[PDB]
Amino acid sequence: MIPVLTSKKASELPVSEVASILQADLQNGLNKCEVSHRRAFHGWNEFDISEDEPLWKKYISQFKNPLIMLLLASAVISVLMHQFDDAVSITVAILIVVTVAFVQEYRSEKSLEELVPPECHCVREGKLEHTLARDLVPGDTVCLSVGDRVPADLRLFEAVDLSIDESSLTGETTPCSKVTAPQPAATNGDLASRSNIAFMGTLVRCGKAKGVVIGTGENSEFGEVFKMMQAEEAPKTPLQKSMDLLGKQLSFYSFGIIGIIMLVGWLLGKDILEMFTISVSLAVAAIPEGLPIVVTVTLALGVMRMVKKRAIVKKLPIVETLGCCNVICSDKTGTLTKNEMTVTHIFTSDGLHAEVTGVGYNQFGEVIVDGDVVHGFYNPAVSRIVEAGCVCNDAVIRNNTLMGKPTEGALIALAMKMGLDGLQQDYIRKAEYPFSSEQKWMAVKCVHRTQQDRPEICFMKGAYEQVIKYCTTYQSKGQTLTLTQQQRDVYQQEKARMGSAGLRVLALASGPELGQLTFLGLVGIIDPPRTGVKEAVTTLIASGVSIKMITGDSQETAVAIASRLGLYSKTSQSVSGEEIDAMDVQQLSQIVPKVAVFYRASPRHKMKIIKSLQKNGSVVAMTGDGVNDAVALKAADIGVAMGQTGTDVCKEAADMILVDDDFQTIMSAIEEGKGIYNNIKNFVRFQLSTSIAALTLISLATLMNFPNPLNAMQILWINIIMDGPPAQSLGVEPVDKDVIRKPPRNWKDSILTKNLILKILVSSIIIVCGTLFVFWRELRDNVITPRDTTMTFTCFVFFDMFNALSSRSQTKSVFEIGLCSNRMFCYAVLGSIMGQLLVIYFPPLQKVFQTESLSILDLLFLLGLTSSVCIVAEIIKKVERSREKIQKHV
Numbered sequence: 001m002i003p004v005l006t007s008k009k010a011s012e013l014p015v016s017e018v019a020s021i022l023q024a025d026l027q028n029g030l031n032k033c034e035v036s037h038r039r040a041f042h043g044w045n046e047f048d049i050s051e052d053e054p055l056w057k058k059y060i061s062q063f064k065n066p067l068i069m070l071l072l073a074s075a076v077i078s079v080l081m082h083q084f085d086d087a088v089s090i091t092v093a094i095l096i097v098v099t100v101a102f103v104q105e106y107r108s109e110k111s112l113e114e115l116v117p118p119e120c121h122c123v124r125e126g127k128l129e130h131t132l133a134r135d136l137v138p139g140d141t142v143c144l145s146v147g148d149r150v151p152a153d154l155r156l157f158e159a160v161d162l163s164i165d166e167s168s169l170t171g172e173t174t175p176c177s178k179v180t181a182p183q184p185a186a187t188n189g190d191l192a193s194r195s196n197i198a199f200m201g202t203l204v205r206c207g208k209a210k211g212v213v214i215g216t217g218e219n220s221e222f223g224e225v226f227k228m229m230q231a232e233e234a235p236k237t238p239l240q241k242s243m244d245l246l247g248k249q250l251s252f253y254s255f256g257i258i259g260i261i262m263l264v265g266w267l268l269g270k271d272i273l274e275m276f277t278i279s280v281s282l283a284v285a286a287i288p289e290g291l292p293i294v295v296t297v298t299l300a301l302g303v304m305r306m307v308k309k310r311a312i313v314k315k316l317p318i319v320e321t322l323g324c325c326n327v328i329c330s331d332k333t334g335t336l337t338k339n340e341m342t343v344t345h346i347f348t349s350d351g352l353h354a355e356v357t358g359v360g361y362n363q364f365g366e367v368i369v370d371g372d373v374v375h376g377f378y379n380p381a382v383s384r385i386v387e388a389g390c391v392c393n394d395a396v397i398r399n400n401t402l403m404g405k406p407t408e409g410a411l412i413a414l415a416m417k418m419g420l421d422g423l424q425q426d427y428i429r430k431a432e433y434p435f436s437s438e439q440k441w442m443a444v445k446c447v448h449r450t451q452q453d454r455p456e457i458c459f460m461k462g463a464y465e466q467v468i469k470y471c472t473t474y475q476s477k478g479q480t481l482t483l484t485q486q487q488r489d490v491y492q493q494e495k496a497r498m499g500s501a502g503l504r505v506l507a508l509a510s511g512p513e514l515g516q517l518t519f520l521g522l523v524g525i526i527d528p529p530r531t532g533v534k535e536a537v538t539t540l541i542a543s544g545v546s547i548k549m550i551t552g553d554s555q556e557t558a559v560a561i562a563s564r565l566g567l568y569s570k571t572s573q574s575v576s577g578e579e580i581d582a583m584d585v586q587q588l589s590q591i592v593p594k595v596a597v598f599y600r601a602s603p604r605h606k607m608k609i610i611k612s613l614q615k616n617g618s619v620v621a622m623t624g625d626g627v628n629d630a631v632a633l634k635a636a637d638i639g640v641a642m643g644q645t646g647t648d649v650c651k652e653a654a655d656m657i658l659v660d661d662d663f664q665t666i667m668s669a670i671e672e673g674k675g676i677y678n679n680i681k682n683f684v685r686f687q688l689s690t691s692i693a694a695l696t697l698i699s700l701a702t703l704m705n706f707p708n709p710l711n712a713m714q715i716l717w718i719n720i721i722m723d724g725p726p727a728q729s730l731g732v733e734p735v736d737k738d739v740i741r742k743p744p745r746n747w748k749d750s751i752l753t754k755n756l757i758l759k760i761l762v763s764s765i766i767i768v769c770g771t772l773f774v775f776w777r778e779l780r781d782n783v784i785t786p787r788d789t790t791m792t793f794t795c796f797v798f799f800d801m802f803n804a805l806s807s808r809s810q811t812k813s814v815f816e817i818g819l820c821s822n823r824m825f826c827y828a829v830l831g832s833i834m835g836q837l838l839v840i841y842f843p844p845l846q847k848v849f850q851t852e853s854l855s856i857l858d859l860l861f862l863l864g865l866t867s868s869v870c871i872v873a874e875i876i877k878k879v880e881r882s883r884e885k886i887q888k889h890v
């Protein structure tokens with residue numbers, strides 16, 4: 001059997017011993033059968049899933065709520081009293097309440113169980129595959145590049161200037177350097193001296209590494225520490241504690257009102273038992289005992305609906321601030337535009353204009369100069385630019401797939417169209433200066449493969465303003481002349497003409513050494529934008545949010561794209577990158593609400609901009625994707641990391657990520673969050689309206705005479721129907737398309753507004769008026785009849801049902817939506833109707849409850865009169881929509 005060795009054993013033993021003991025191939029790797037055997041033997045590369053849930057313990061913990069315990073105490077002291085029906089009814093009712101609370105808790109636990117398995121790169125069968133870190137087995141060959149995180153315990157056998165961040169493991173802010181040499185047995189006392197082992201969960205900052213898996217899952221003390229630190233957390237949502245405070249205030253007000261009405265009923269009154277029972281009923285009915293449950297389940301359904309649309313968001317409280325945003329920055333490449341570059345226009349230093357046809361990275365296409373087809377080395381000016389773009393290239397084309405930068409793949413395809421694919425191997429690359437964000441140029445110094453006696457030739461490419469600083473001469477009609485200022489102005493004007501059409505400009509120069517280069521020409525690398533982003537950005541800035549652009553390119557093409565998709569209003573400015581560099585946050589904070597395009601910028605500037613965006617009243621939505629951009633995401637409130645082109649540093653230490661990079665997904669998530677908030681507001685509105693109506697009805701009933709026709713069991717059933725399946729049906733709801741045009745909700749604003757208060761008060765007074773009308777119409781000279789109680793109970797039930805029906809959406813009436821789209825509402829409605837009809841006619845229940853019989857014409861009159869609240873709500877909604885239309889028409 002293969003033994004599992006610890007970290008110190010792999011540290012003290014050389015690479016040969018750790019390879020022979022583990023039987024791991026450094027170059028070939030392990031086979032599929034051996035990997036499957038090791039996975040079946042040692043298990044999966046995850047923490048031990050040993051967690052049992054005593055569902056019976058949860059069921060009994062659903063008890064002990066003081067109010068239901070006082071209800072059970074009343075029930076048992078009633079058993080002591082010479083009576084049986086009230087006791088058994090109260091016991092069955094409290095049983096239904098406990099089981100509905102338990103199933104609600106189980107559903108909330110399921111929703112809270114409802115982001116991703118972490119992927120990695122592994123070398124198996126001699127090939128590198130992008131596989132799951134969960135299926136990793138001890139002995140696999142793992143490659144770690146910049147950005148990638150260490151999946152499991154790794155024994156380093158190859159390392160190039162590797163620096164790994166271990167602050168999450170030991171707390172040191174300084175990354176330690178890794179080496180492949182074995183450490184002596186004397187220095188293995190502390191953890192910081194272990195520079196030959198890559199531990200699980202560590203973050204690789206820089207460098208490259210190739211190691212062998214030695215420890216997975218449980219076979220690591222650091223793995224145990226991680227399992228115990230990142231398993232039990234409690235990141236409560238600000239909206240959650242806000243709703244908790246609101247519910248506590250409502251409960252305190254309800255308890256005060258109940259104490260007041262009890263003091264009133266005690267004076268000039270008797271039958272203390274019924275008063276205490278009805279007080280307990282009002283206490284269990286008025287208070288919201290399901291607000292956290294419904295808010296959690298609606299947040300979970302919202303996050304599930306938004307991840308269904310390819311939008312993964314961690315840090316659940318972020319869903320609270322999702323949609324509250326008002327400034328959403330974006331980059332040109334990636335989110336706002338697909339990563340596809342195509343060379344279309346070529347401008348040589350001689351003044352020639354060449355057009356390149358064909359779309360895609362293939363050999364299909366031709367170069368036309370003044371009507372003539374240029375192939376091979378027919379035109380010196382064009383062929384020089386082609387060879388300069390080809391010899392200085394890091395991307396490679398294979399089976400129409402590009403490996404590297406797409407901007408270099410564009411020049412690769414351009415050389416392919418001219419039949420110059422085999423030129424890149426004709427030169428021997430000697431010196432390389434790669435393309436960096438600070439220098440913005442890439443240079444290669446090479447010699448010919450068969451003409452090594454010739455002087456070394458260096459080719460530089462990049463931005464015009466950076467390349468032209470190294471150019472001293474130019475070519476015209478085959479003659480090398482000196483670069484005058486007029487030639488520089490002509491080149492700048494041509495760059496402006498190219499940028500005005502939305503083409504990325506790229507300058508190229510060639511020479512014997514750096515500093516005495518001749519400038520060959522410019523190329524127009526067009527970038528087709530994604531389809532559908534135009535209308536999205538149009539409807540985004542039309543109300544609420546404002547989109548920015550951090551491209552890092554020149555101002556010309558940036559403004560061209562921002563005008564094509566639509567970002568530049570008549571009153572808008574644009575700032576450079578050197579302007580942000582030589583300026584503090586205070587002076588910048590006064591020009592940010594006007595600027596919308598950031599050209600010639602860099603991620604190093606982004607953080608600073610964020611500070612300015614944090615100076616005034618606003619919240620940031622960044623879109624960092626590459627390296628050295630995770631700190632900007634952490635400093636901002638939320639950070640949008642891309643899935644395809646995204647490192648692990650900017651993925652795990654970040655916020656909501658977007659797979660299948662696009663721009664409308666943020667808008668969809670914003671609409672989802674706003675719909676969640678609207679559903680929560682509608683549920684709170686319905687609950688508060690029903691509670692206020694019941695409280696004022698009970699008060700007007702027990703005021704000075706004519707005691708309440710609603711008994712304890714009836715009010716408890718009303719509580720069940722107010723906080724049951726028809727209650728949470730309002731929380732979960734498919735959103736319509738109206739909130740994207742609404743202004744964003746401020747963080748200072750609460751969930752209760754003036755119109756909501758007016759609506760709940762109108763609903764309550766209508767309920768009370770209808771109930772009093774029914775009470776007056778049922779009896780004229782009759783003191784007390786059970787038919788009166790039945791009529792009042794069924795009337796209040798039907799009124800609550802119609803009020804819940806009218807409370808489907810605060811911005812949409814019942815006519816626009818149908819009897820679908822969360823049909824669970826209609827399911828709960830029909831279930832409650834069946835339960836009510838069973839309560840009406842059931843001889844075994846007629847002794848339990850108060851209802852014993854009813855008439856058909858009485859039921860018809862009840863359904864005819866109950867629609868008053870519904871018609872009033874629809875009338876006020878129609879007049880509000882008419883006022884909205886007449887105010888937008890002017």
Ligand SMILES: Nc1ncnc2c1ncn2[C@@H]1O[C@H](COP(=O)(O)OP(=O)(O)O)[C@@H](O)[C@H]1O
Nearest residue numbers: 333407435437440441442461462463551552553
């Ligand atoms: N491989 C490269 N060689 C030389 N110059 C480049 C290369 N790639 C990009 N550039 C230039 O450097 C600029 C900066 O690129 P980057 O900072 O990655 O932003 P973006 O790619 O979105 O423009 C580009 O606008 C382009 O002019």
Ligand code: ALF
Nearest residue numbers: 331332333551552
């Ligand atoms: F892809 Al960029 F700045 F937009 F590096």
Ligand SMILES: [Ca+2]
Nearest residue numbers: 284285286287
């Ligand atoms: Ca209640």
